[PDB]
Amino acid sequence: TWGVSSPKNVQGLSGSCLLIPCIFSYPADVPVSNGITAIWYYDYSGKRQVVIHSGDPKLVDKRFRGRAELMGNMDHKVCNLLLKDLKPEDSGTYNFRFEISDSNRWLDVKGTTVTVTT
């Protein structure tokens, strides 16, 4: 049911890409007749910058424009995030959130912490 699954920690290296495995879950009795909106946030508690937005890619922060991709299959509960050409600044917490229909939305409050090594 209601939940998101992703590693507490992830390490990567500059220049290289990185994949944060992710899978979400929700009650089967909830109607999803309009698709699901995937949204990846960076530093939710602070700046709260939008890394990914299946709904409207116009909402993506520039900091991340072009260097993030959602390699998931929404119809499979998969929300894998791929960050291209890692950088030291890209370190921080990434939180996933999906929306099925207003009253039906879910944010993962734990998130994944990315540490970009040397």
UniProtKB/Swiss-Prot annotation:
Tissue: Detected in lymph node in the subcapsular sinus, interfollicular regions, and T and B-cell boundary (at protein level). Expressed by macrophages in various tissues. Highest expression in spleen and lymph node with lower amounts in lung, liver, bone marrow, heart and skin. No expression in thymus, kidney, brain or small intestine.
Chain residues that bind N-acetylneuraminate: 44, 97, 103-107
Result after altering residue 2 to Q: Loss of sialic acid binding
Domain Ig-like V-type: residue ranges: 1-117
Knockout-associated phenotype: SIGLEC1-deficient mice are viable, display no gross developmental abnormalities, and exhibit only subtle changes in B- and T-cell populations. However, they are significantly more susceptible to bacterial infection than WT. In addition, serum IgM and IgG amounts are greatly reduced in mutant mice.
Induction of synthesis: By interferon-alpha.
Disulfides per UniProt: 22-79
Domain of life: Eukaryota
Family: Belongs to the immunoglobulin superfamily. SIGLEC (sialic acid binding Ig-like lectin) family.
Oligomeric form and interacting partners: Interacts with CLEC10A.
Function of the protein: Macrophage-restricted adhesion molecule that mediates sialic-acid dependent binding to lymphocytes, including granulocytes, monocytes, natural killer cells, B-cells and CD8 T-cells. Plays a crucial role in limiting bacterial dissemination by engaging sialylated bacteria to promote effective phagocytosis and antigen presentation for the adaptive immune response. Mediates the uptake of various enveloped viruses via sialic acid recognition and subsequently induces the formation of intracellular compartments filled with virions (VCCs).
Name of the featured protein: Sialoadhesin
Gene: Siglec1
Whole-protein coverage range: 20 to 137 of 1695
